[PDB]
Design a protein around this ligand. Structure first.
Ligand SMILES: *[C@@H]1O[C@H](CO[C@@H]2O[C@@H](C)[C@@H](O)[C@@H](O)[C@@H]2O)[C@@H](O[C@@H]2O[C@H](CO)[C@@H](O)[C@H](O)[C@H]2NC(C)=O)[C@H](O)[C@H]1NC(C)=O
Ligand SMILES: *[C@@H]1O[C@H](CO)[C@@H](O[C@@H]2O[C@H](CO)[C@@H](O)[C@H](O)[C@H]2NC(C)=O)[C@H](O)[C@H]1NC(C)=O
Ligand SMILES: *[C@@H]1O[C@H](CO)[C@@H](O[C@@H]2O[C@H](CO)[C@@H](O)[C@H](O)[C@H]2NC(C)=O)[C@H](O)[C@H]1NC(C)=O
Ligand SMILES: *[C@@H]1O[C@H](CO)[C@@H](O)[C@H](O)[C@H]1NC(C)=O
Ligand SMILES: *[C@@H]1O[C@H](CO)[C@@H](O)[C@H](O)[C@H]1NC(C)=O
Ligand SMILES: *[C@@H]1O[C@H](CO)[C@@H](O)[C@H](O)[C@H]1NC(C)=O
Ligand SMILES: *[C@@H]1O[C@H](CO)[C@@H](O)[C@H](O)[C@H]1NC(C)=O
Ligand SMILES: *[C@@H]1O[C@H](CO)[C@@H](O)[C@H](O)[C@H]1NC(C)=O
Ligand SMILES: OC[C@H]1NC[C@H](O)[C@@H](O)[C@H]1O
Ligand SMILES: OC[C@H]1NC[C@H](O)[C@@H](O)[C@H]1O
Lengths: 496, 618
């Protein structure tokens, strides 16, 4: 079975007392449901839970309105029927360069301590190592307090000159934003007085929340005034600095209080997540969100919740294909699998400071074949061979992958990243495979996802496949055993 | 002496009068389930066949007092318990309960009220809610009294058609949490006379203050900036006020600087714009012989420099999950409220009070708010409060280190806190709706509940627009008549001063200050010292010395100071006389007239604008 929710430990196929099926931050929890989910499950043997339901999901591996935020008021053919019936499609395609050039993020590289000096040094190193850039994403924290939209003049003494130097060096820029106003923000009082925040149950006062950056209120995206207000500050940041778009962080209702009031009543709390994702709409072309609750027709990128610099299915390298396939199934084609190499969080890093070298390389390779590719910890943090491998995969993405992604993106208005069973719906091996995927119907990808491996088994389904080296495999289906894939290579095959 | 039927019970006294009558209103007993073992009558199910823990236990604590312990405890959640207590015929008068907005003596409750939580509320704007000072205690002129048990999730309503109080236990739609199944339980006691049974009940249930406030608080006028200047108080205005107090030759217990002297609500430091040299102001006030108290409150607004400090040190009342501060609205805006159950929040509050005394030799503090009507519906505290109003108690405890010149405006078992208790803001009107005619009822009500050191708010009221007979300030006759009755109360507080009017008003105030100093103050100090022993109030109703006298039971325009000084102020406009009731015994007027043909109603007894009628026991 396939579908349901993005999870912390993501298996494909899918593989707990029923808890609310609501948008949560699953970074620290293997119980909760991730920021992107639909009440939709698909079987390899060829269900849509009704939107009305105060829906709670549990599970029992042995056989395979109270205490809740809910208030009362062949396999390919059937999947395509269900997708067409229930999921709206994006009507627009993001910027073409987002499907070709690497995105560069300050977050994993610098953390909160990002600076004017560090942004410009990052951009210079991107140019010196001869990489294109879709855009540069300035993350947490570039403001004096969480809720202020203006740049902190201590860390950014001449924002204008930074943006001018970045523009002159051919860099598009996106800015990190979020739905919170902390109590020590210069905008908190403004928000209390204009009644822009999510309220306690009686609906008279703001309700305080805790998120990873502290304590404040959360904007009510059901309130026209709160939306106009949020949008106004985004438009001011574009006007002042020619910023292209925004990374929309949080959006999960796990950051809203248990019981809460909104301008419009939300019998389904997760519709708050939807209303937040709608803030991406005016800047969709280079926007990203990390939640999706009927957010499919928002034509921006959808980011997997923070990946850890580990190998395993627990937000690591082996989670990428399951997570991307899961999200693709739910009608979100424009997927960004977070950061190449992961976020390098201490105690959650195979390595110490940064991901071990082999992990960075293997990740880079699989990320080069995904709809959008984002570096933070850059190739030149390692050595010249890693830079060269990244240059090779940038070139290969530009010439082979990007043109195919752009065609499939235009077509969507089906997913872009497809499971093997998409073209082989009757094939039980294709049903189980988690280490391979398709881009459209014609490009099959088999990355190495383990350390100390210069080969792997590659399953080819029925029909004819041409390897990158030009080998024609037409005695299919077949398992190619110990197929050579050196550290600096990926196995891919084209339809023929 | 108790008749138990399926639908309620009645109690008689030894003379065979019905002194208590109560209807069961959430069910009936199945009497066949009842049995008597000696003094205990227990019943095990209702007339619908639902299981019940019901008993009446008779207790004879003294030769002259019969009590009845009553429990009605339902089997499970879902089932609110209601008993309707009938007040009875027109000869039965009742006293106690709560300070209310419209305060009558004896108790009169108009219209219909579904039982609402018996919790400390701000009744300035509401004739429904229960005021800042209340006890679950009602007293009858027929010498019966009821104390509702402290355990009860107690809700009080009333029904004027049958003249009943609606006593209710419930756990749905209420700030009451069960201690970590509804139960209505109470004791009814019967005595020989209303004074005897009241003194039995007071001695059993109410703690006494162990200390007396500063002697001068019982003699000299208190001067408040609030009604005179409002929020816009400043350094110039405080010193000008103090100079005028001295020039018009008035003593001062202390000067009370009210709202607002800080840059934000939650900051303890003085605002340097309005008070450019606080130190020099306090030095000039000290040199001119002025003790000073400062207005404080339990709130920290979101734009206070101390708000972040309070979030981080977790000093505030939390939302139900107990993780984050809960925001509240009060009349000065939006912030958090300090958790006075938290040792750290108390140390913190106290620290800032001690710093204000150390820095400025401030004497004490006026502790504003304290009502749980300013706490959120559902809320968490460091120690759990199954009874939310215990928060009010915990707040009043902040007065303890500075009791001598402290005032609070709430009391929830706060009796043994030996500070003054202020009536909630009086309006500059004549009527029972927080006006002149409310003073005697409100003071008598609070005195009955074990709070002897009463401050009846501000002479002339607070002069709020839309709520002032006069316009800008109270009409002249109202100010004078109020001044006169306030001169006979345990503490007297001016804000709008006599010289706002004319020289005749100043002279009247000087006369009443002199009369308070020489006649009233010496008697107040003796009775205040006596409370600590007797538990008896300072301001007493006429029936205190005349418990069998039905006229004394009904009088709301007269009161006693102790047993020996009877006071009859004029409480109406255009009157230079009033009827004065003297109970049995001998009474000597201020002019020396001996009345010994008593009881008597003295009709059209002369009391000019600048006079009060008083009589001494002879
Ligand atoms: C006005 O106050 C004076 C002075 O009060 C005395 O000193 C104060 C600092 C304080 O400690 C008071 O408690 C003192 O009594 C009053 O004059 C005194 O009156 C009392 C009795 O009330 C008498 O025993 C004292 O001997 C007097 N002391 C002096 C210095 O004269 C005066 O009574 C007050 N006037 C009014 C109208 O209250
Ligand atoms: C207030 O008390 C009155 C008097 O007991 C109630 O009115 C009576 O209600 C009963 C209900 O069964 C009627 O059968 C009586 O005949 C009524 N008599 C009169 C004169 O009204 C009234 O219901 C109570 N009000 C509330 C709000 O509970
Ligand atoms: C002052 O009055 C308070 C309020 O009644 C007393 O507090 C109670 O004391 C008992 C026994 O110490 C405790 O078990 C209760 O929990 C207290 N109640 C509350 C609400 O705090 C206090 O004991 C009195 N102190 C003195 C010295 O009389
Ligand atoms: C701002 O608020 C956060 C919590 O919301 C707190 O940790 C931090 O100390 C505050 N910063 C300042 C400048 O006060
Ligand atoms: C960089 O961008 C240019 C301009 O659009 C494009 O022709 C080229 O393919 C890109 N370079 C790489 C390495 O993909
Ligand atoms: C009153 O409450 C006490 C203490 O909770 C309880 O034990 C007692 O028995 C109650 N009295 C009645 C008459 O129910
Ligand atoms: C706090 O908010 C109130 C209400 O708007 C405002 O009048 C006051 O000046 C504010 N105080 C500070 C110091 O921010
Ligand atoms: C207040 O007055 C005294 C005496 O004039 C002076 O020495 C002190 O520094 C002044 N302080 C301020 C706050 O102006
Ligand atoms: O605090 C920054 C951090 N927050 C969580 C996001 O998922 C990350 O990409 C990054 O924006
Ligand atoms: O804001 C101050 C105001 N608040 C309510 C009090 O009861 C008044 O005396 C006065 O202190």
């Amino acid at each position: 079975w396939y579908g349901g929710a993005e999870m912390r430990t993501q298996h494909w196929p899918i593989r707990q007392e029923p808890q609310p099926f609501v948008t949560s931050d699953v970074y620290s929890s293997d119980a909760a449901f991730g920021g992107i989910l639909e009440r939709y499950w698909l079987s390899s043997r060829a269900i849509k839970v009704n939107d009305s339901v105060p829906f709670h999901l549990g599970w029992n591996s042995t056989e395979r309105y109270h205490d809740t935020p809910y208030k009362p008021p062949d396999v390919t053919s059937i999947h395509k029927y269900m997708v067409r019936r229930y999921f709206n499609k994006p009507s627009r395609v993001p910027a073409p360069e987002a499907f070709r050039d690497p995105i560069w993020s300050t977050w994993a590289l610098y953390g909160r301590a990002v600076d004017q000096d560090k942004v410009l040094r990052f951009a210079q190193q991107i140019r010196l190592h001869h990489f294109n850039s879709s855009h540069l994403e300035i993350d947490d924290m570039y403001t004096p307090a969480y809720g202020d939209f203006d740049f902190d003049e201590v860390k950014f003494p001449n924002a204008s000159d930074m943006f001018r130097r970045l523009r002159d060096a051919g860099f598009r820029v996106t800015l990190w934003v979020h739905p919170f106003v902390n109590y020590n923000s210069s905008r908190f009082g403004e928000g209390v007085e204009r009644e822009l925040f999510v309220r306690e149950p009686t609906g008279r006062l703001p309700a305080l929340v805790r998120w990873w950056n502290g304590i404040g209120a959360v904007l009510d995206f059901t309130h026209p005034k709160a939306r106009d207000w949020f949008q106004g500050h985004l438009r001011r940041l574009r006007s002042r600095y020619s910023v292209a778009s925004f990374k929309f962080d949080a959006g999960e209702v796990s950051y809203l209080p248990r019981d809460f009031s909104t301008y419009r009543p939300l019998p389904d709390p997760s519709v708050w997540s939807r209303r937040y994702t709608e803030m991406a709409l005016p800047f969709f072309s280079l926007a990203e969100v990390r939640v999706g609750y009927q957010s499919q027709n928002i034509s921006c990128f959808f980011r997997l919740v923070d990946r850890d610099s580990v190998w395993g299915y627990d937000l690591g390298l082996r989670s990428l294909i399951p997570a991307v396939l899961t999200v693709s199934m739910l009608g979100y084609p424009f997927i960004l699998p977070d950061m190449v190499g992961g976020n390098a969080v201490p105690q959650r890093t195979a390595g110490g400071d940064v991901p071990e070298r082999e992990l960075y390389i293997r990740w880079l390779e699989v990320a080069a074949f995904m709809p959008a590719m984002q570096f933070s910890i850059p190739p030149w943090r390692y050595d010249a061979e890693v830079v060269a491998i990244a240059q090779k995969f940038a070139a290969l993405r530009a010439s082979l992958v990007a043109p195919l992604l752009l065609e499939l993106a235009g077509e969507v208005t089906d997913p872009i990243v497809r499971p093997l069973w998409w073209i082989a719906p009757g094939d039980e091996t294709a049903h189980r495979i988690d280490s391979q995927f398709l881009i459209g119907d014609t490009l099959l990808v088999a990355p190495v996802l383990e350390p100390g491996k210069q080969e792997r088994d590659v399953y080819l389904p029925a029909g004819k496949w041409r390897s990158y080296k030009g080998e024609l495999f037409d005695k299919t289906p077949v398992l190619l055993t110990d197929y050579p894939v050196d550290l600096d290579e990926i196995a891919y095959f084209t339809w023929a």
